[PDB]
């Protein structure tokens, strides 16, 4: 259905669009994810053939490598060229690449790498650099009692210290979730800069708000 | 009590008897002598009937 | 503009049909011409609405 | 200008001929009032609705009514210390809203002040827009189990 060649015994580096080298089909939404063995971070380099719809300012197609496995986490790059890739890295081993797809558009693909083991120095958690828990946990399902408190159960870092657990919630297959909020209390109401809840979709892009539920009331989606 | 209105020892348009009243009115309140005031006048002579 | 160098201007074909363009008033030469007039049929821009 | 660069204007917009400053413009009142229920509550709504549209109740509906009634904007600023104000101790400090009116970080107190004498000396009240006193709760009389002789 979706990308091709996927393979991750320790994975070698070979991300490529779902027809390469052909013309990759029209409205594709490809999830790229690769945030495993700590110590390695990132190198793109998609390796020598590159073409993907030349748009004024792009506006067509997107290779966003924004690092960290969503929409919201910083940006590193937008790529829609006929000139080969940027050569990056962004400090860390948390990544997210999509391969946006409007209705006309053609003509190569990538094939990517990563060939890395670094470390960074600081530290983040404790220790060198503590790779820390992307906060986070997954869970399947028909019922979930998803809590804020199983970060107060188990929270992997330091009480006082700013959290980012983010869930998601599978399916049983071929259906539709229907979220409900049971409990719901902020600290403070009403500032959305420090604290809210969001529920996007599937496929975590930032161009997928349902909803930012941060005031004081939150209803079901 | 349908509607509220309140009495008011009166004074002239901007002086300072209207604040050094407002002092003095508001002690009596919390002294009990102004309820103590309205229960020697207001008191009728002898209804009780136990109902 | 046309770009001067290739003969495909399927990245300017988007961009009007996207834009609701539906009147154009093409200065090519008959060589030009026909190799506009074919890449305006594979994007679909060839309806009874343009001219 | 420079192809590399591009507009590098150096007209940097110093200090403009026209800079005067408010004393009577609106001010914009810092009205500072409390959370109690019903008087101020916060709105019950789901988007991020703030400035001075978060709040609700009945002591702020009389504060909006002030506004058309006197013409101003007020600007409703939760109390930092949840106390309304009392005399302190030795201190002899006030603590709260009090303490925000005499130290003219609040042009208006627009909440349940109970007016009363160690308080009218030290700030001004206008005259009572509610009258209240001591009252007593109870259970409302129930279905009377009557005793066993209610024959
Ligand atoms: C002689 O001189 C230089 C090199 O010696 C060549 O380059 C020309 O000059 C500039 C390069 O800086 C080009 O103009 C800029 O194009 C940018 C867009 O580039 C994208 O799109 C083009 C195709 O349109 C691709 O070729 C390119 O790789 C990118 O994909 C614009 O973003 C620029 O706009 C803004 O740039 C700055 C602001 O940062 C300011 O100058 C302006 O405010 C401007 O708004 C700018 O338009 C120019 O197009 C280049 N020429 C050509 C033909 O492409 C010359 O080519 C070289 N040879 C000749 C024959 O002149
Ligand atoms: C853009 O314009 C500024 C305004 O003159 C240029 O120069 C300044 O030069 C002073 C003098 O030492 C320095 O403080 C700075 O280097 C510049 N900026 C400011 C705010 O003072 C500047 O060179 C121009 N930019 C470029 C890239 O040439």
Known sequence: ?221 | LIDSKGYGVGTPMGSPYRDKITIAILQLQEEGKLHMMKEKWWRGNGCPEEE | ?51 | ?151
């Open chain 3, 1 to 51: 503009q046309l770009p001067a160098d290739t003969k495909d201007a399927k990245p300017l074909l988007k961009e009007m049909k996207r834009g609701k363009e539906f009147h154009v008033i093409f200065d090519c030469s008959h060589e030009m011409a026909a190799g506009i007039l074919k890449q305006a049929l594979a994007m679909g821009m060839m309806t009874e609405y343009y001219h």
């Open chain 1, 1 to 221: 259905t979706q990308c091709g060649i996927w393979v991750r015994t320790s994975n070698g580096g070979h991300f490529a669009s779902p027809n390469y080298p052909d013309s990759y089909p029209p409205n594709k939404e490809c999830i790229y994810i690769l945030e495993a063995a700590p110590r390695q971070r990132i190198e793109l380099t998609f390796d020598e053939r590159y073409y993907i719809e030349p748009s004024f300012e792009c506006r067509f197609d997107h290779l966003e490598v924004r690092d960290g496995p969503f929409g919201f986490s910083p940006l590193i790059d937008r790529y829609c060229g006929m000139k080969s890739p940027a050569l990056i890295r962004s400090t860390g081993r948390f990544m997210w690449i999509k391969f946006s797809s409007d209705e006309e558009l053609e003509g190569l693909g990538f094939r990517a790498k990563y060939s890395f083991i670094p470390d960074p120095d600081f530290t983040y958690l404790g220790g060198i650099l503590n790779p820390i828990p992307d906060c986070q946990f997954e869970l399947s399902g028909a019922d979930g009692i998803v809590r804020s408190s199983q970060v107060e159960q188990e929270e992997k870092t330091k009480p006082g210290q700013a959290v980012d657990c983010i869930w998601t919630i599978k399916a049983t297959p071929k259906a539709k979730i229907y979220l409900r909020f049971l409990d719901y209390q902020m600290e403070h109401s009403n500032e959305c800069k420090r604290n809210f809840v969001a529920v996007y979709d599937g496929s975590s892009a930032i161009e997928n708000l349902k909803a930012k539920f941060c005031s004081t009331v939150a209803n079901d989606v």
């Open chain 4, 1 to 151: 200008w420079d192809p590399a660069s591009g507009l590098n204007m150096t007209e940097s917009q110093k200090g403009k001929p026209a800079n005067i400053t408010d004393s009577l413009s609106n001010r914009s009142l810092i009205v500072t009032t409390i959370l109690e229920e019903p008087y101020v509550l916060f709105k019950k709504s789901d988007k991020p609705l703030y400035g001075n549209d978060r709040f609700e109740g009945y002591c702020i509906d009389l504060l909006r009514e002030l506004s058309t009634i006197l013409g101003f904007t007020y600007e409703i600023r939760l109390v930092e210390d949840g106390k309304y104000g009392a005399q302190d101790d030795v201190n002899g400090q006030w603590n709260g809203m009090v303490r925000e009116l005499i130290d003219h970080k609040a042009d208006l107190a627009v909440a349940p002040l109970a007016i009363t004498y160690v308080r009218e000396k030290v700030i001004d009240f206008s005259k009572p827009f509610m009258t209240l006193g001591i009252s007593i709760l109870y259970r409302k009389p129930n279905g009377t189990n009557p005793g066993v002789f209610s024959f």
